[PDB]
């Protein structure tokens, strides 16, 4: 077990501390993102300890701006930090340029935040010991590359996706998605899609309480689907299965 201490290099040149943080995100409840030339969807499994917690209390999906939403997975305390830096990074830009920030440019800032942690500092002060125990599903729309979807990894790196899923049943979905996704997916299509892979690799009987759902478009911007829209959408779902 020697070789597990943050800035330490494995003899195969690897950083486990980092790699474990990833193993944190695993424990989070599942989150799924789907990008369609029509708009972008963000849906997450809720999973509540007791019926006395007020679902809406769990901010698994949050607004970062009229044009950018987000879903997290894993460590909730750490989330609040990234969410706040991001929210700030956005507004700041708008104050400086009177425009909107490029989704990736934003995303960048966030990853710029992540990997900025030292161990006594071999030059740069970095006040925060270890990496983040959380990942992000950033999903917005700038007018240069239209609709966009990203994956924020604690390692300070990231990737652009068409559809991606983080959380508990990561592969359970990624496999599914791997062969469900196609460009000309409409938005209505995408919703019922996320809503299906959740239910599957989900845990309990799917219903608005255990599943928050949202989306964002050029039209209206980031909107978090109230419990009605979600509820009925369940029906249009659980009905088509009966047939095929």
């Amino acid at each position: 077990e020697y070789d597990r201490g943050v800035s330490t290099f494995s003899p195969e040149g690897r950083l486990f501390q980092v790699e474990y943080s990833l193993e944190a995100i695993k424990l989070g409840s599942t989150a799924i993102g789907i990008a369609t030339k029509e708009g972008v969807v963000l849906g997450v499994e809720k999973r509540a300890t007791s019926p006395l917690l007020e679902s809406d209390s769990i901010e698994k999906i949050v607004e970062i701006d009229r044009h950018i939403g987000c879903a997290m997975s894993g460590l909730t305390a750490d989330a609040r930090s990234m969410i706040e830096h991001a929210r700030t990074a956005a507004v700041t830009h708008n104050l400086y340029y009177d425009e909107d920030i490029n989704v990736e440019s934003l995303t960048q800032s966030v990853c710029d935040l992540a990997l900025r942690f030292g161990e006594g500092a071999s030059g740069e002060e970095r006040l925060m010991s270890r990496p983040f125990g959380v990942a992000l599903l950033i999903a917005g729309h700038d007018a240069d590359d239209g609709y966009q979807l990203f994956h924020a990894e604690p390692s300070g790196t990231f990737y652009r996706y068409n559809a991606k899923a983080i959380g508990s049943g990561s592969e359970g979905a990624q496999a599914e998605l791997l062969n469900e996704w196609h460009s000309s997916l409409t938005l209505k299509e995408a919703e019922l899609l996320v809503l299906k892979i959740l239910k599957q690799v989900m845990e309990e009987k799917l219903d608005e309480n255990n599943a928050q759902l949202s989306c964002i478009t050029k039209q209206d911007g980031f909107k978090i689907y109230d419990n009605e829209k979600t509820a009925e959408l369940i029906k249009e779902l659980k009905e088509k299965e009966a047939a095929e």
Partner: protein
């Protein structure tokens, strides 16, 4: 069975080695492949963008630092960005203050002296990424090989990354030829392209996998993305 001499970047092995820095070079060997090659009219960087999944984008490995300079990288993105970023300032300092375009020899100097610090002080760790640099100053073309160990060497061409060998050799041989390819860009590239394809194993390169960069005698540093490189396949 045991080895205590590999604790911090700060400790010497009985013989006089720094295992920590040695490991960083291993993560360098782990990342994707990339190539550089020069002549007297231009310089070229060619790299293999590697994607995570099939539903994801390929992580880019080239970066501009000025109209006349750039690099590719083998290893950790973060580490790289930092270094390239620091580099960007250094050129800017020169331009504004002195109004002279930064010489490559000197660019390597700074990246040595920079990465150097991390090998002498406790607390940190060393940079996990290597870089091939290209540029065109007043001494014509130039090309550099940089290691986290702070060693920057001036070459004629090279590769770094996983299975970087096969290209290093292709290059070693076809040398006499390309060092003479002056006035023709597409030639240097096709050459470079062949040198790299001479290292694939998973499969051939596509419009999405490929990426190229160039800089020269009238060719300010520019990059070719995807469908733009289409021809060179």
């Amino acid at each position: 069975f045991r080895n205590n001499y590999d604790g911090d970047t700060v400790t010497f092995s009985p013989t006089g080695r720094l295992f920590q820095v040695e490991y960083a070079l291993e993560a360098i060997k782990q990342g994707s492949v990339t190539v550089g090659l020069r002549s007297n009219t231009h310089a070229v960087l060619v790299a293999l963008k590697r994607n995570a999944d099939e539903l994801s984008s390929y992580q880019k490995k080239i970066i501009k630092c000025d109209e006349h300079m750039g690099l590719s990288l083998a290893g950790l993105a973060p580490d790289a960005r930092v270094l390239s970023n620091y580099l960007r300032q250094q050129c800017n300092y020169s331009s504004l203050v002195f109004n002279r375009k930064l010489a490559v020899e000197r660019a390597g100097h700074l990246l040595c002296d920079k990465a150097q610090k991390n090998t002498q002080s406790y607390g940190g760790r060393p940079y996990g990424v290597g870089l091939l640099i290209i540029g065109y100053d007043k001494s014509g073309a130039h090309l550099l090989e940089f290691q986290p160990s702070g060693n920057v060497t001036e070459l004629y061409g090279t590769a770094i990354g996983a299975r970087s060998q096969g290209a290093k050799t292709y290059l070693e041989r076809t040398l006499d030829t390309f060092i003479k390819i002056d006035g023709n860009p597409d030639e240097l590239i096709k050459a470079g392209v062949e040198a790299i394809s001479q290292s694939l194993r998973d499969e051939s390169l596509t419009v999405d996998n490929l990426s190229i960069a160039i800089v020269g005698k009238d060719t300010p540093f520019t990059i070719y993305d995807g469908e733009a490189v289409a021809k060179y396949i």
